[PDB]
């Protein structure tokens, strides 16, 4: 298939992998810090999805240095992946408009 479409799929796979690794690592980083709520895997995975999409509910977040570093990798992976899908959609529409104009 075309590059952009492939890169998108790849982006979707890496993101899913980042979500899972991120959930596991967040718990590992947060347990041990009194007050931390990002300490069980199921909600940590919900936290990972919230972070990747920047939905901003604010119901969960890391309070430790390492947890925050993990958060940044997930945010960037999410913002980048969704942004990459936008670019793929753009390349797709541009190719079609070219045809439609007989170019």
């Amino acid at each position: 298939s075309a590059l952009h479409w492939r890169a998108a799929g790849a982006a979707t796979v890496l993101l899913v992998i980042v979500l899972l690794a991120g959930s596991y690592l967040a718990v590992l980083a947060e347990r041990g810090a009194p007050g931390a709520q990002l300490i069980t895997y199921p909600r940590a995975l919900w936290w990972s999805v919230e972070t990747a999409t920047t939905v901003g509910y604010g119901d969960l977040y890391p309070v430790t240095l390492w947890g925050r570093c993990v958060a940044v990798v997930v945010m960037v992976a999410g913002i980048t992946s969704f942004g990459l899908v936008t670019a793929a959609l753009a390349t797709w529409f541009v190719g079609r408009e070219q045809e439609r104009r007989g170019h």
Partner: antibody, heavy 118, light 106 residues
Framework: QVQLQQPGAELVKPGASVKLSCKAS????????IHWVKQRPGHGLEWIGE????????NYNEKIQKKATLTADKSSSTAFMQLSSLTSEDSAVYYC???????????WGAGTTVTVSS | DILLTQSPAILSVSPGERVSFSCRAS??????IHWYQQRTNGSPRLLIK???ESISGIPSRFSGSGSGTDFTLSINSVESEDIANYYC?????????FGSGTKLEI
């Protein structure tokens, strides 16, 4: 079958130290945490600390003096709690429990009764 | 550290009656509260997880309710084998903590 196996007892001299063991069986996941809980005769349950074998990291109760040190052998899937410089205040039943990383202690060992005296 | 208050410390009831144990958290913890039963010389046993979820292998006369800071463990038609100590435990914030326990007496 019995998911967690602990020795029934340990006698320790005041000042000495002992290493409690907890052999686990049944399903095992990298997300498993092994906890240790202390119960003095007549009193309640006191969380001591936890450890995640799949990584070897451990956390301890900060509100109490640190008498324990946790470790785990992934091959023999056994968890250990090193208690050191014990006094009579350390005499109690020490339970180990398994948590699937979802907050609750699904299974507990029978507990090891530790007595500190000469 | 989340403080879990279990009061009264002792609860006396007649056979077959419905009984309720109380557990108050020092701050809101959603439904991240779990209940254990510990009989004489026995080790703790999970009865209810996440405030109201039944555990397979536990009699249906055991149920839980509540959210936020107030939780209740209930036993419908109490019977002799229920004689024991009951503890609540929270997993909302680190570190996990236990309540002081309530003893059931018939």
């Amino acid at each position: 079958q019995v998911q967690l196996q602990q020795p029934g007892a340990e006698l320790v001299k005041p000042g000495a130290s002992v290493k409690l063991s907890c052999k686990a069986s049944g399903y095992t996941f990298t997300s498993d945490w092994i906890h240790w809980v202390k119960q003095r005769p007549g009193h309640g349950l006191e969380w001591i600390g936890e450890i995640i074998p799949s990584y070897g990291r451990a956390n301890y109760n900060e509100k109490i003096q640190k008498k324990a040190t946790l470790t785990a052998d992934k091959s023999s899937s056994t968890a250990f709690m090193q208690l050191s410089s014990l006094t009579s205040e350390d005499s109690a039943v020490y339970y180990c429990a398994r948590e699937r990383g979802d907050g609750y202690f699904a299974v507990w060992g029978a507990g090891t009764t530790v007595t500190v005296s000469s | 550290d989340i403080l879990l208050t279990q009061s009264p410390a002792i609860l006396s009831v007649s056979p077959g009656e419905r009984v309720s144990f109380s557990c108050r958290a020092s701050q809101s913890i959603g439904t991240d509260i779990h209940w254990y039963q510990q009989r004489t010389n026995g080790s703790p046993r999970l009865l209810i997880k996440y405030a109201s979820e039944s555990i397979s292998g536990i009699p249906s006369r055991f149920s839980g309710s509540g959210s936020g800071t107030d939780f209740t463990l209930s036993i419908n038609s109490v019977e002799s084998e229920d004689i024991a100590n009951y503890y609540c435990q929270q997993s909302n914030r680190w570190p996990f903590t236990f309540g002081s326990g309530t003893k059931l007496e018939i």
